[PDB]
Amino acid sequence: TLTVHVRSEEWDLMTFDANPYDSVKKIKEHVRSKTKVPVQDQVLLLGSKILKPRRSLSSYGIDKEKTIHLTLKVVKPS
């Protein structure tokens, strides 16, 4: 389906599968599995855009791509 590469400042590159129409929250749950960072403390970026957890990757323009590169930041929420 779709392969997601998640790069971060702290950990090795993460790889896992995703669906472009699922919420970004589903990505964060994969990150939580690999890093144990709770979903509420993660921020994901596509390019330089911060993704909102309720939105889908498709809504940010992920259409035909077979592989995408995301950035993870660990952030204490307000």
Numbering used by the authors: 4 to 81
Task: List sentences from the manuscript.
FAT10 is the only UBL modifier to directly target proteins for proteasomal degradation independently of Ub attachment. At the very C-terminus FAT10 carries a di-Gly motif that is a hallmark for the covalent attachment of Ub family modifiers to substrates through a conserved enzyme cascade. To characterize the structures of the FAT10 domains in more detail, we crystallized the N-domain and solved the solution NMR structure of the C-domain, since we could not obtain crystals of the latter. Both domains adopt the typical ββαββαβ β-grasp UBL fold.
To improve the long-term stability of the wild-type (WT) human FAT10 protein, we replaced the four cysteines in FAT10 with Ser, Thr, or Leu depending on whether they were predicted by bioinformatics analysis to be solvent-exposed or buried (C7T and C9T in the N-domain; C134L and C162S in the C-domain). For further structural studies, we designed a Cys-free FAT10 construct lacking the N-terminal four residues (ΔN FAT10; amino acids 5–165) and Cys-free constructs of the individual N- and C-terminal domains (amino acids 5–86 and amino acids 85–165, respectively; hereafter referred to as N- and C-domain). The N-domain crystallized readily and we solved its structure at 1.95 Å resolution by molecular replacement. We could resolve three virtually identical protein chains in the asymmetric unit that superimposed with a backbone root mean square deviation (r.m.s.d.) of 0.66 ± 0.01 Å for amino acids 8–81. Only the N- and C-terminal residues (amino acids 6–7 and 82–84, respectively) display distinct conformations and increased B factors showing that these residues are disordered and not part of the UBL fold. Of note, the side chains of residues 7 and 9 that are cysteines in the native human FAT10 sequence are indeed solvent exposed and only residue 9 is part of the UBL fold. As in Ub, the core of the UBL fold is stabilized by a dense hydrophobic interaction network that is almost void of aromatic residues. Overall, comparison of the FAT10 N-domain structure with Ub showed that not only the structured regions are well-conserved, but also the lengths of the loops except for the α2–β5 loop that contains two additional residues in the N-domain. Interestingly, the hydrophobic patch in Ub (L8, I44, and V70) that is used for most Ub–protein interactions, is neither conserved in the FAT10 N-domain (E15, L51, and K79) nor in the C-domain (S95, T133, and A159). To compare the FAT10 N- and C-domains in more detail and to identify conserved regions, we generated a multiple sequence alignment of FAT10 proteins. This revealed a conserved surface in the FAT10 N-domain that mainly consisted of the β5 strand.
